[PDB]
Design an enzyme around this catalytic site. Structure first.
Site, PDB file in Angstrom:
ATOM      1  N   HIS A  47      -6.008  22.320  -3.241  1.00 20.86           N
ATOM      2  CA  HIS A  47      -7.267  22.291  -2.473  1.00 20.86           C
ATOM      3  C   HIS A  47      -7.629  20.847  -2.165  1.00 20.86           C
ATOM      4  O   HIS A  47      -7.125  19.953  -2.845  1.00 20.86           O
ATOM      5  CB  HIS A  47      -8.389  22.875  -3.362  1.00 20.86           C
ATOM      6  CG  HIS A  47      -9.687  23.051  -2.646  1.00 20.86           C
ATOM      7  ND1 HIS A  47      -9.854  23.747  -1.454  1.00 20.86           N
ATOM      8  CD2 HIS A  47     -10.904  22.641  -3.059  1.00 20.86           C
ATOM      9  CE1 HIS A  47     -11.161  23.711  -1.155  1.00 20.86           C
ATOM     10  NE2 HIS A  47     -11.793  23.052  -2.108  1.00 20.86           N
TER      11      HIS A  47
ATOM     12  N   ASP B  76     -17.525  19.969  -0.866  1.00 22.01           N
ATOM     13  CA  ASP B  76     -16.348  20.852  -1.027  1.00 22.01           C
ATOM     14  C   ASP B  76     -16.642  22.086  -0.182  1.00 22.01           C
ATOM     15  O   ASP B  76     -17.636  22.790  -0.408  1.00 22.01           O
ATOM     16  CB  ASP B  76     -16.198  21.091  -2.526  1.00 22.01           C
ATOM     17  CG  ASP B  76     -15.006  21.930  -2.949  1.00 22.01           C
ATOM     18  OD1 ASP B  76     -14.583  22.796  -2.168  1.00 22.01           O
ATOM     19  OD2 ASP B  76     -14.551  21.723  -4.110  1.00 22.01           O
TER      20      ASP B  76
ATOM     21  N   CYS C 131      -9.054  23.930   4.024  1.00 21.60           N
ATOM     22  CA  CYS C 131      -9.782  22.899   3.226  1.00 21.60           C
ATOM     23  C   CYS C 131      -9.527  21.499   3.762  1.00 21.60           C
ATOM     24  O   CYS C 131     -10.499  20.696   3.758  1.00 21.60           O
ATOM     25  CB  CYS C 131      -9.499  22.949   1.730  1.00 21.60           C
ATOM     26  SG  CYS C 131      -7.692  22.825   1.417  1.00 21.60           S
TER      27      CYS C 131
END
Lengths: 221, 79
Positions: free
Chosen positions: A114, A131, A180
């Protein structure tokens, strides 16, 4: 409106051709970031970005934004695994000093699965963790924020950083498992422009093509 | 300690010391290190003080000094 532009048909076709090239050739080499076809293909639809594309985008934001440093993702790896000593020499190679900057961006690779982003805002005296697949403030996010606060205190020779506010910043969340790295790039783009984080997943689709266009057009001059 | 430079390449567990001319490309050095780890060159990033070295750049190109260290890092991916 949106800070991620749509490509004209000609520019989009150039991206599609480059994604199909038959063999791993060098597509760009500028400002100490070399990009091959293998790296470029991580911008294809649904693909995970690699560190080369993240670094290229950090360089692009540094090239277009004043008083800003955007490190590659190996900066956080070293800082977290090997302390301030592991990144002590890095700001010198940026040809600048922490007291002349507005922001420092630190893209973070988490367990080879990620991407997330740290934003040190020297002008606002804040350290933020952003995030795109988060349920919220958690403990790993705290180790990251304290690591970045530690960096600021050490790099500045204990002049700045001890009173910064550490924040888990809210942002648009990805609706899939592969964007991501694109959300990291959108968060750097919008954070560098001090723009409200109101992009969405359609911007993420366009972002892949936008970054690919920047590479093919040698945007770092 | 004029024309030649001493350099160490490390991946954090395996470290190899080299002595090359300051005007010699790092390619051979980098390929030697990778081969010893049995790893492909395109899977490893060689950094000097955070700068991603391009094979073909020399120590003089990067402003290296005697006994500097080159870090060999694994490619990173993420979703």
């Amino acid at each position: 409106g949106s800070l991620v532009p749509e490509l004209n048909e000609k520019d989009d076709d150039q991206v599609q051709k480059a994604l199909a090239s038959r063999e791993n050739t060098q597509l760009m080499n500028r400002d100490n970031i070399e990009i091959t076809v293998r790296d470029f293909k991580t911008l294809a639809p649904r693909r995970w970005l690699n560190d080369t594309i993240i670094e290229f985008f950090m360089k692009y934001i540094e090239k277009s934004t004043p008083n800003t440093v955007a490190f590659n993702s190996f900066f956080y790896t070293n800082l977290s695994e090997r302390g301030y000593q592991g990144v002590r020499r890095w700001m010198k190679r940026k040809k600048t000093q922490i007291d002349k900057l507005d922001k420092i961006f630190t893209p973070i690779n988490l367990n080879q699965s990620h991407w997330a982003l740290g934003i040190i805002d020297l002008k606002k005296k804040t350290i933020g963790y952003v995030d795109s697949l988060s349920n919220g403030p958690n403990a790993m996010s705290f180790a990251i924020l304290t690591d970045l606060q530690k960096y600021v205190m050490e790099e500045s020779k204990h002049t700045i950083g001890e009173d910064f506010d550490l924040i888990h910043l809210d942002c648009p969340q990805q609706p899939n498992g592969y964007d991501c790295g694109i959300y990291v790039c959108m968060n750097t783009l919008y954070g560098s422009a001090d723009a409200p984080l109101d992009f969405d997943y359609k911007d993420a689709i366009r972002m892949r093509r936008f970054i690919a266009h920047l590479i093919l057009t040698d945007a770092l001059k | 300690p004029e024309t030649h430079i001493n350099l160490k390449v490390s991946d954090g567990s395996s470290e190899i010391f080299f002595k090359i001319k300051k005007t010699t490309p790092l390619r051979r050095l980098m390929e030697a290190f990778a081969k010893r780890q049995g790893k492909e060159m395109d899977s490893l990033r060689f950094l000097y003080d955070g700068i991603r070295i391009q094979a073909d750049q020399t120590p003089e190109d990067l402003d290296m000094e005697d006994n500097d260290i080159i870090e060999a890092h694994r490619e990173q991916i993420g979703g």
